[PDB]
């Protein structure tokens, strides 16, 4: 109802399972505050690039602007933040991209990018961290890091289940835990408020399954649960049972044995992708210490958004870190890094977060060559060290580019 | 019962705050399962010599064995892995050091190291840490990183509050979850496992004042509350409001202006300390990122678990990293790795943490010259590149020392 949807221009398609893409797709894309306005255009402009190079011409992308944050509420009036159109259009659409987005303090509001994906049911978080050569790092050896997140998107204490200390709500349940349920382990049962973390068998395994499965098809070496399940035994520590238990009836897992930890054999490749599992504290020791031992990690909400932060730091790539929520209906790639209020129009930061969730989408499109291009362009502009403000700062020999520069040095080394 | 008291020796006293110690007290000390058998009696061995060489005589430990684990269901009978005079003598005695822990699975048995602080009401885990120069380092700057966590112990998720997924007791808090308080929000309530997180406001408000406090007294430049209440709002999100509340009520904060960062000054050094606050997951990248920007840190039980193994990664200390759980009425100091049972009895691993822990002991005893030599003696050993197997795996140059040894170098380097 103000979104102009392309003249030119045809719907991606799930016929069972399967995207069928056109040749001339129609792709949501929310432009995103703060910084949103300098990124994605940088974004639009490496895309179209890639696949007019790719593809000679034959292929082109139909791009419709659809609204969430700020932005939304300067175009359908001060109170709405997530247009309920968005919802039904991502969902329509099949696969859309965004950028940072804000949201309020001061009204009751949930933050709007757990909103989109709890709301859509987007229930992968995927975030590839991988190093590239030549990206400043604060470790001695970031090339060692070569590792995808599963995330698990939509329940532990991210559902939103809360009540505030002193609300009459939190003094009921906390009346009905010591009373109807005896507990006596609250310390401090007033001016307490309560959280609540979920965690189904349904939602790990539809999760763990995702991640094996990427597993076989991009035969990988392994798979790591990580859990504080011998603190939290019926969340975490289900979890971490519920993902080998998975692996052994679904993926034929074994026992290397002695055990705990499993064998599967991809079926395609031949190989053995071992199924393990790392206490979660140790494991943010691990990633740092013998990055080399892991692969594809398999995680709750809360510890997937801390492993994915950490380790994207580690590379050198908080600025560059790209993103998907994949739910079984639609795929959302994302800017992972915030607003940036005090740079936004300035063009100056880095537009290689949202760049990259662009190639991560055009490879879930089958769109692969365009795919190749960016990451292509990608090295080969850092490793020219034509760079933007926040890798020169790092790096000696540098040659300082704007954001919308960065998308044209892209370009070049596409 | 099975706890033979020094004959020579006195109890230390709480007299109102302020603790008196004796010239010869007698110090609980719980050695530990797995390599406690190993680190244990080389920390009773450099105390001695720390405490000999200090005082010249005057003053020397009355050590006194007692029981947790599973060498306490060898002393006392199959069933008992926490005997409840541990707790009355680690009260009585007001000092107590222990060595590592083993929790059985299959008894449905909560964690001990947990169950103590707990059961005491040990409130703080302090854990410094800082670089040892010459360990190896995974991070190019080690040197950056001098970080003192005060982690809350007595809520948070930790607190043990969780039914299995198809219980009864889940099957009931999920219907008065849903029924009751109308939660809408659990994706899968069928065969889901619920946890509890409780934060209460004089849980946090009791570990803010002691951060702040430590920051006086040592006259550290900040102290950050770490929380993730963006997405937590009513339990790390009130954290952090109870917090700079605290430092604004009892320490004299004012906005650094603008806000939302506060300014105490100290009153004693007539310097500032900066309290401000990060959502966690972007710590996690500041911390490798930005190492000197933080000094003292505040944050609740899980996100004090996470932090503080990271940082004693980075530094290269995940053997050597003492830690300290302090209550009004007794503190706790500990190693803080585990019980390594494929390396136990063969003199070894690292003693370095618990004997960290056991200069932190010293240091709050008032014994601080005692403490000084441990850490000379320390940093004497690591220096000589006289060191044991995991440190020299990632040397070159180094001397291979047992465990019992390293103690030894320690004692000559003071
Ligand atoms: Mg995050
Ligand atoms: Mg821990």
């Given at each position: 109802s103000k979104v102009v949807v392309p003249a030119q221009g045809k719907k991606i398609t799930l016929q069972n399972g399967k995207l069928n893409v056109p040749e001339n797709p129609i792709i949501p894309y929310i432009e995103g505050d703060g910084i949103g306005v300098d990124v994605t255009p940088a974004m639009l402009k490496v895309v179209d690039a890639a696949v007019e190079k790719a593809y000679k011409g034959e292929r082109k992308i139909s791009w419709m602007e659809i609204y969430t944050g700020e932005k939304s509420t300067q175009v359908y009036?001060?109170?709405?933040?997530?247009?309920?159109e968005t919802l039904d259009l991502i969902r329509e659409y099949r696969v859309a991209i965004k950028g940072p987005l804000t949201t309020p303090v001061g009204?009751?509001?949930?933050?709007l990018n757990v909103a989109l994906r709890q709301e859509l049911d987007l229930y992968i978080c995927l975030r590839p961290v991988r190093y590239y050569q030549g990206t400043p790092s604060?470790?001695?050896?970031?090339?060692?890091t070569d590792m995808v997140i599963f995330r698990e998107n939509?329940?532990?204490?991210?559902?939103?289940?809360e009540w505030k200390a002193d609300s009459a709500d939190a003094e009921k349940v906390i009346k009905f835990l010591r009373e109807?349920?005896?507990?006596?382990?609250?310390?401090?049962?007033?001016?307490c408020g309560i959280g609540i973390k979920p965690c189904s068998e349904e939602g790990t395994k539809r999760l763990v399954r995702a991640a094996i499965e990427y597993a076989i098809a991009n035969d990988r070496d392994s798979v790591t649960l990580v859990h504080?399940?011998?603190?939290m035994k019926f969340t975490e520590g289900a979890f971490k049972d519920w993902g080998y238990q998975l692996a052994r009836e679904e993926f034929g897992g074994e026992l290397?044995?002695?055990?705990?930890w499993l064998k599967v054999k991809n079926?395609?490749?031949g190989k053995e992708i071992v199924i393990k599992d790392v206490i979660a504290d140790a494991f943010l020791q691990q990633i740092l210490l013998?990055?080399?031992?892991?692969?594809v990690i398999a995680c709750m909400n809360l510890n997937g958004d801390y492993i994915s932060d950490a380790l994207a730091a580690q590379v050198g790539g908080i600025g560059i870190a790209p993103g998907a929520n994949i739910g079984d209906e639609c795929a959302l790639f994302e800017a992972?890094?915030?607003?940036?209020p005090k740079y936004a129009?300035?063009?100056?930061?880095?537009?290689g977060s949202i760049i990259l969730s662009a190639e991560m989408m055009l490879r879930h499109m089958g769109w692969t060559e365009a795919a190749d291009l960016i990451v292509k362009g990608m090295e080969g502009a850092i490793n020219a060290k034509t760079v933007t403000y926040d890798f020169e700062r790092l790096m000696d020999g540098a040659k300082l580019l704007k954001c919308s520069e960065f998308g044209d040095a892209i370009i070049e080394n596409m």
């Open positions: 009036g001060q109170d709405v933040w997530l247009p309920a009204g009751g509001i949930r933050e604060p470790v001695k050896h970031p090339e060692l939509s329940e532990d204490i991210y559902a939103g289940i109807e349920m005896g507990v006596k382990k609250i310390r401090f049962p007033e001016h504080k399940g011998n603190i290397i044995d002695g055990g705990p079926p395609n490749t013998r990055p080399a031992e892991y692969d992972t890094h915030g607003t940036a129009g300035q063009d100056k930061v880095n537009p």
